[PDB]
Point group: D2
Chain length 331, copies 4
């Protein structure tokens, strides 16, 4: 008897690896619900003889029993080979398995696609699938994902205790994002200023206020003073990735300010149906609404962000999926 | 401005009160999820002046802050006047309210079907409701329940660490209800033994072999050695039949024995799609199937009930609604 | 018969109230330990007939059952009759009472003394007592505390997930208390500057700089840029100082900077043996040390304050007493 | 710098392995407190090469981080080799390490003593040690355990929800010990019955009554009905057993019945100061005391056993040590 719930969780990354922190946050929610961590360290697999890799995995999995539910946050970023072998280890236990997709590698870019057959093959060894969007599920099914049981994540949480402050109507735009991933910054043409929070040492266009990498808590603290959240991606290419959930979008709303997002985003409806800000087409549509928007137009939009965001702040999108995933994994 | 979640919880009913312990169980789940208790004692409120009363409530709610969330488990059994008075207090606080329906008082027994409209009245003020089933919601909106966000319970959990003994093919039928609430018991006609667990003494058709009320643990221990669980009503209430979730349906499945229940029950889809037992017309239909089933087809059903029940034994039907309810309360 | 643990937790006070904060905060640990809140609202008491109020007490306490455990965080700041009568309610239950002393209102400021004998009366009605320091238990004994089982708090935790930024050597002293309760502040003379975090802006010595009351979170960040935490009281309150636990003490150490405290203060050996700042005898011994301190010496001292402070940031002083209190309340 | 607590958890033993059952239960408690499991599987270490093992260990510790804290339930039963190396692994991380002793190999009997120096070697790499009895710590320090912070366990908890049946005065002695280890059983000559609960098929002396192994919950329910619980040694396995905490002792008390224990065993002061049973010289002293005891005396003895066992049923002896151990690991 006595079933337990385990969740994989990666470790050993740069303190700025967003993938790692996103897994770490989910795992944090998991523990409070009583679930148990399956630690996974990120290392180079080829340093391992198959037998060594095997028994490393036996070490990761030691605690497991015919019994349990395992939540697999994919990918481990130890390359596909690791995910593949991780799963077979899992599948030789008498367990139900939830795969929690954070990224889909063969869809990260064209010509990485070939990995799809392998990927889908191990995706289909799971009993329940949690995907960020309904869109993601539907293309994943277009490549042979057979799994009957599916959950939509909808939106990244952002558990925190930051102080929200009184929010001014500042006609600024926040963007905590590495500039060498998003070209649109280096192209900043507009009279409204782009606050850019980045560790990387360099200089930026004339009305782009470069700001050194703040610790998250402080970042949430500062942004809560006003302005807007920019959710842009990924510059030109890497855009059909209208699939996954942005982590900064959640990071914005938790601060308590409205957001701006480009049309077609994953789980767009959430933003409309909950008031959180504007969905626009071009970068230029934005400048217009930031420049030409009413002060109490802004007043409202905040009041709602802060109405909506205790979900994000106490982590309820995550609680939701970590609970139904399991439930649907039995029933 | 920091959200916490409270849930209302009964205290002071008898050892043998299902209403209280179904609520206590929910509460114990809520605690493990981090939620906080608004304790509520059951008493005649005729002994309160509608102001001493207000202050008692004020002391029930003194932990509450502004955009916390309250889960109200209804009913309180302190009478409708309390229910709505408890409730009205919550509306003062600028919070979001979850109404968890254990029972709708004015449907159960057509004495006091009249209280309905004051019930609905204080129902229509919550922000989301969690109800036994969709058919239960549907009948409620027919009475004017204007609440948009709904959410279906589906099944009672029965969280426990009780030992499951190997199930063998006792051609027994188990039944831990109360003979003069479920009076189809005094009408036993069939050559299949009916075991009945209850407070009331001295009432026996003949093959109804009755036993004294046992602590929940033991019941589930001994029921696990084999046989079938039965979930049935009088014709008295075959409408409320099709609405509620039964506690002993959950109390059977956690014992890891198959159940037999009446076609038209709320959420029979769960019994079917998870093959947890037989869905059947009349009680004769049952006895036939209890007689005609062979050893191996019973092995499948037990294995299926036992594939299924850690869900019920670890609190997940509850955990489910305790988490989505709070979620849909903020979302739109 | 299943033991649940309860803790009291006052509410409704000003978001600036340290009393409420040091209670909500402990309660918050207790919740995560699975304990349950007994919410309490702070209000002026005699808008209540002795019978009305008794029924609001009945509402705060409805969730209790015999053989539970209740932790009374005292005082409630609802005056001493409330402490007395609350406690009286707890004693008609078959329970064990942990009395957790956050303050002793009689030994606090003079004139409050007269309530001493009544306070000891209801102190002596609990099973285990939790006091800030052994020295405080000793004084309570001299005034008639007859409760056998004592347990020392030691220090306030300061749970937080705030950023500690790189600290060292700002040659400045930090002080987040109201100036009106410590007026050593106004007689500030010495050339090193005093940051003061407070509600007011009344008065202003030259080398004293003030800041508007920042939310706890942001404060600990800033303080974590270096400088010293000064734990001081105005010397009418030294009788008390040698007994209580200072919350700002923890707030400093939580930010990750070394402290300055006065000799004789409660649980000083804590500071000594974990090397978290200086113990000095006057204000002037202090400034002397704030100047004349090597960058290397400050280095290590910070290093020590941060070897140490996950204790207070994860709640372990609170977790410690909350566990042992309930234990000794049963063991003998 | 976010401190997390980890605890090692042995797995993959037979369901009758008390070692595993004890480590599992501590861990379940730990998990409730927010601590984190380091799972470990039991297996022949010889199937691994240095490289293989190093990496198996790597995978066990993947989640580990600097500034975390790890609690090592020792021994793993993967042999000393494995224990030494697991510890070497842990010391590589900049963490604080609590060592929870369940057994000490080089003391299990003579000739195993050569293992002492290697055992002590790695024991001394700990910051805090938790032993069952103060007696245990004293003996360890006579061999070179230089770890300055020690904490005492005292007694096994037994988290359970068994129904405590009404307890009659059954002049019989329960004993769920496996005979092959406890040979005093075979020597049973006494007119008082001896319930021996054992999975082994091997017939037993006359007024010994053999029960097949039963689930722990059923056992506890059975014994709750009444009678006495015996905690007895063997004779050679005795000195070493004066240092341990018996697990079945806690089984009794949680069951709700008094106990009978041989003079000198670890932590007997808990039995005496809490009324838990009799402490006696030989086997006969027992039968005497069992025969020559009145009914009201037994009501007494039970009522205080049931006074006391919420500690064990809710896991507080463990909660104590899991909280204070960790606290003491940061706190010089
Ligand atoms: O100075 C900073 C800027 C970044 N962030 C965090 O790092 C995340 C980076 O977002 P990323 O582009 O990696 O995720 P995405 O939104 O693209 O999914 C932000 O949301 C912040 O929470 C931070 O902690 N400090
Ligand atoms: O001897 C008994 C008989 C009843 N029960 C419990 O009380 C419930 C009675 O079910 P009830 O009819 O009151 O609930 P319903 O199924 O009608 O919703 C059973 O499920 C058992 O869990 C029990 O613990 N011991
Ligand atoms: O701007 C501020 C200054 C104070 N504090 C908190 O309020 C407490 C005031 O301490 P108090 O003098 O009331 O208690 P003591 O430390 O003397 O026990 C400090 O510790 C801080 O934690 C705060 O939250 N914001
Ligand atoms: O039928 C049985 C017999 C024993 N036990 C368990 O086995 C334990 C005793 O094991 P052991 O003698 O090894 O513990 P010790 O007292 O020596 O520490 C009991 O307390 C029970 O928990 C059980 O679960 N069912």
């Amino acid at each position: 008897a006595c079933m337990r719930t385990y969740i994989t969780n990666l470790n050993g990354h740069s303190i700025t690896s967003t993938a790692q922190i996103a897994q770490n946050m989910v795992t944090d929610i998991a523990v409070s619900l009583g679930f148990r961590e399956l630690g996974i360290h990120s290392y180079p697999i080829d340093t391992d003889s198959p037998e060594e890799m095997s028994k490393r995995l036996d070490g990761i999995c030691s605690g497991l029993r015919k019994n349990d539910i395992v939540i697999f946050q994919t990918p481990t970023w130890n390359t596909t080979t690791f995910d593949e072998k991780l799963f077979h280890k899992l599948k030789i236990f008498g367990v139900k398995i939830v795969i929690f997709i954070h990224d889909v590698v063969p869809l990260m870019f064209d010509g990485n696609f070939y990995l799809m057959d392998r990927t889908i093959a191990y995706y289909n060894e799971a009993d329940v699938l949690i995907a960020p969007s309904q869109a993601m599920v539907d293309k994943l099914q277009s490549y042979g994902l057979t799994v009957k049981k599916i959950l939509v994540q909808g939106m990244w949480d952002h558990p925190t205790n930051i102080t929200l402050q009184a929010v001014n109507h500042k006609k600024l735009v926040h963007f905590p994002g590495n500039p060498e991933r998003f070209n649109f910054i280096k192209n900043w043409r507009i009279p409204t200023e782009l606050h850019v929070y980045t560790d990387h040492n360099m200089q930026l266009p004339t009305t782009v206020v470069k700001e050194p990498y703040q610790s998250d808590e402080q970042l949430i603290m500062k942004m809560s003073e006003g302005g807007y959240g920019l959710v842009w991606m990924d510059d030109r290419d890497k855009q059909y990735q209208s699939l996954y959930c942005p982590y900064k979008l959640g990071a914005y709303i938790a601060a308590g300010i409205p957001v701006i997002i480009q049309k077609g985003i994953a789980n767009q409806d959430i933003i409309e149906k909950n008031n959180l800000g504007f969905i626009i087409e071009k970068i230029d549509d934005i400048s217009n609404i930031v420049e030409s928007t009413t002060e109490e137009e802004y007043m409202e939009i905040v009041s709602d962000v802060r109405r909506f965001n205790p979900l994000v702040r106490q982590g309820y999108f995550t609680r939701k999926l970590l609970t139904d995933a399991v439930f649907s994994a039995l029933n």
